[PDB]
Design a binder for this molecule. Structure first.
Ligand SMILES: Cc1ccc(NC(=O)Nc2cc([C@H]3C[C@H]3C(=O)O)ccc2N(CC(C)C)CC(C)C)cc1
Length: 367
């Protein structure tokens, strides 16, 4: 079995395969701003170009990849318009001629009108040469914010984790077939292969250190990934001129927008404890609707946890634990990234919540 409807690719997983790089001509005015955000923010010319912008119909965005590219373009255009050079000069009102098409395209794609992980990681890459493989040396992003923002490194290393994970996600029907067929040797190899693929996924995380600089990240890139839900600089949210008369709050950023970590929680039958369910539930809202439909199709399958416990078989318990441990490792290395790239630069909250989820993962071990 596997996807079609859930849009999980055997090669790139939750990411979008071979994402579109160009929009229809009709949207040339958008593409010019997005493609020149580095030059236009540094010069301050960006906000005049957004305000002298006519309102474009979204009707000429006809396929999914075209519409995905347009959301990335409008989201990047939007983040730069709101935060500027980021030293107190915010815009609390997004101009109708960009907000209306952005909100319309968000309604259609069932995502919030703000830059989201499915935009600038999953849909925001190209291969440099397609005849060679998916490595940092042969990959590039479509959009950045500022020269030296380390957009390239932070987005692509993020995407390479999603790709490593695809190696494990594609093993997931074998688990359920082997349970269905009471084929014990197959399910064990499937668990060991999932564990092994999460352990190689952890090794991709090591690459952040070679392409993302903590200061460039904390003081540049993270301002353009900042949202307006619970933000003092936009206490009430952002006004989408012409689409809602009321200001609306939405979050930014967050590794929590990946589906990878929650995907393996559901599989392994790891439940959340605390009220943390609310936060993980809200993270699904910032995911594409197909990927959230997938995480639900997963809870509808028989419990792999109830299956391994019911057999009394110690090899299977050890392979299930290998996966759960590989998951605590990912959450630990996450945490360690938060220390280097946020906590330390902030000294020049989110960690308590993360520690709790890791504890719940570790407590899900069997032997
Ligand atoms: C808009 C947007 C949204 C989302 C991302 N990615 C992210 O947040 N990446 C990210 C951030 C943090 C620390 C800032 C904290 C946080 O987020 O809790 C830690 C790990 C990662 N990952 C892997 C990295 C090794 C590249 C990502 C997932 C785990 C594969 C990038 C852009």
């Amino acid at each position: 079995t596997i996807s079609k409807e859930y849009h999980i690719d055997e090669e790139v997983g939750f990411a979008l395969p071979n994402p579109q790089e160009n929009l229809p001509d009709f949207y040339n005015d958008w593409m010019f701003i997005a493609k020149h955000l580095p030059d236009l923010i540094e010069s301050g010319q960006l906000r005049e170009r957004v305000e002298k912008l006519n309102m474009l119909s979204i009707d000429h965005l006809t396929d999914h990849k075209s519409q995905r590219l347009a959301r990335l373009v409008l989201g990047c255009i939007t983040m730069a318009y709101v935060w500027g050079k980021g030293h107190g000069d915010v815009r609390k009102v997004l101009p109708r001629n960009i907000a209306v098409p952005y909100c319309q395209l968000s309604k259609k794609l069932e995502l919030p009108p703000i830059l989201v992980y499915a935009d600038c990681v999953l849909a925001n890459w190209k291969k440099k040469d397609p005849n060679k493989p998916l490595t940092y040396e042969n990959m590039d992003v479509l959009f950045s914010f500022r020269d030296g923002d380390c957009s390239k490194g932070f987005f692509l290393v993020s995407l390479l984790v999603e790709i490593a994970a695809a190696s494990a996600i594609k093993v997931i029907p074998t688990v359920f077939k082997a349970m269905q067929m009471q084929e014990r040797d197959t399910l064990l190899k499937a668990l060991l292969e999932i564990a092994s693929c999460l352990e190689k996924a952890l090794q991709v995380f090591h690459q952040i250190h070679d392409h993302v600089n903590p200061k460039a990240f904390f003081s540049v890139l993270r301002i353009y990934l900042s949202g307006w839900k619970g933000n003092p600089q936009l206490s009430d949210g952002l006004v989408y001129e012409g689409f809602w008369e009321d200001p609306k709050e939405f979050a930014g950023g967050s590794a929590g927008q990946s589906s990878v970590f929650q995907c393996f929680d559901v599989l392994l039958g790891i439940q959340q404890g605390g009220h943390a369910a609310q936060f993980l539930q809200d993270m699904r809202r910032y995911m594409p609707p197909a990927h959230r439909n997938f995480l639900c199709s997963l809870e509808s399958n028989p419990s792999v946890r109830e299956f391994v416990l019911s057999k009394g078989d110690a090899g299977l318990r050890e392979a299930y634990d290998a996966c759960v441990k590989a998951l605590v490792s990912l959450r630990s290395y996450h945490l360690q990234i938060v220390t280097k790239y946020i906590l330390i630069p902030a000294s020049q909250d989110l960690m308590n919540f993360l520690k709790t989820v890791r504890s719940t993962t570790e407590k899900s071990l069997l032997k």
